[PDB]
Amino acid sequence: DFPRSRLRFKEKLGEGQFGEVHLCEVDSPPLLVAVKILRPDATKNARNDFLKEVKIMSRLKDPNIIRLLGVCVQDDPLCMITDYMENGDLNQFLSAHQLEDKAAEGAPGDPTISYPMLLHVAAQIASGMRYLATLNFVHRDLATRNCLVGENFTIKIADFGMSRNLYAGDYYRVQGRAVLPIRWMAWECILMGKFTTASDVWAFGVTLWEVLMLCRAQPFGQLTDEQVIENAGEFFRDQGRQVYLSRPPACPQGLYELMLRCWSRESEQRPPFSQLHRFLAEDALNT
Numbered sequence: 207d208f209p210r211s212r213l214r215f216k217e218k219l220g221e222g223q224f225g226e227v228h229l230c231e232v233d234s235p236p237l238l239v240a241v242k243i244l245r246p247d248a249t250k251n252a253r254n255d256f257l258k259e260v261k262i263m264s265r266l267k268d269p270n271i272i273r274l275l276g277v278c279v280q281d282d283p284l285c286m287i288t289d290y291m292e293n294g295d296l297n298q299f300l301s302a303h304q305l306e307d308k309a310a311e312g313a314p315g316d317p318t319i320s321y322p323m324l325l326h327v328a329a330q331i332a333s334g335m336r337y338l339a340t341l342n343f344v345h346r347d348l349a350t351r352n353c354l355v356g357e358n359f360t361i362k363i364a365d366f367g368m369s370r371n372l373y374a375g376d377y378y379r380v381q382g383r384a385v386l387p388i389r390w391m392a393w394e395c396i397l398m399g400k401f402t403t404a405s406d407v408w409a410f411g412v413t414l415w416e417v418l419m420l421c422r423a424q425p426f427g428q429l430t431d432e433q434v435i436e437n438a439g440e441f442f443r444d445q446g447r448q449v450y451l452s453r454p455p456a457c458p459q460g461l462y463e464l465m466l467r468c469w470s471r472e473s474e475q476r477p478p479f480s481q482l483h484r485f486l487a488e489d490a491l492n493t
């Protein structure tokens with residue numbers, strides 16, 4: 207529907223396995239947008255993956271999920287258009303802030319963030335996930351690296367895939383197998399390969415941990431990949447030897463207990479996103 211000639215390409219925002227994303231200016235109904243196009247080395251298989259992503263993205267209509275603003279008309283070279291999220295991925299964003307020392311002592315733009323803003327960030331992710339659940343849409347790779355930050359701490363969940371070198375340490379790779387974000391994965395995912403809304407809740411638990419850590423350390427960071435995979439086996443055997451992420455310094459005990467529930471052995475005992483969102487938006491403000 208959208209004429210490609212109306213785009214003015216400005217800078218490269220990233221590249222993935224089957225496309226790359228550029229910052230563009232538009233003059234028509236200057237707006238900035240993010241535009242995904244085929245890579246220069248695009249193959250028949252990459253174009254197929256691109257077209258399928260267009261179809262997947264057409265499903266997703268929520269304030270806290272990446273939205274498809276437009277696509278280029280059939281004549282033109284393929285493209286997808288979305289909102290420009292000026293503050294980049296959430297992991298880099300939080301890494302550049304520290305928790306405020308005294309409440310409301312700073313100015314806008316300061317490298318500090320409040321505990322209630324951390325809740326606001328996490329609640330938005332929870333709201334996005336709540337939406338995906340109503341679609342029976344399973345994400346499979348929720349993490350702060352896959353969220354984007356706009357103006358005024360607005361958050362949108364994306365899905366970059368697994369090829370950014372910056373996050374290569376977050377994925378476990380074996381020749382001929384799917385690439386796996388094991389440190390964010392529920393035990394039943396690691397052992398049995400099956401991904402559900404309930405395993406997305408588990409990943410949300412780890413993502414919430416990340417947010418409260420201000421992304422200062424990797425989940426299970428002092429443990430090897432092999433040890434993390436063995437931990438899943440300890441969940442299975444249920445002999446009380448499994449281990450969990452520790453309580454972040456910015457996280458009160460009440461919120462941490464909620465976090466722990468996301469990592470329940472039984473999928474059905476993990477809180478739904480509706481419950482997670484309510485806690486983050488309201489209960490977590492309790493003294």
Ligand SMILES: CNC(=O)CN1CN(c2ccccc2)C2(CCN(C(=O)c3ccc4n[nH]cc4c3)CC2)C1=O
Nearest residue numbers: 219220227240241242272286287288290291364365366
């Ligand atoms: C929920 N599934 C998805 O979101 C899948 N999708 C679809 N999608 C997309 C991108 C453009 C147009 C249409 C769709 C992306 C968004 C994030 N990506 C970026 O490279 C990126 C980087 C910095 C940015 N700043 N502002 C916006 C930015 C975008 C990877 C591609 C993605 O993960």
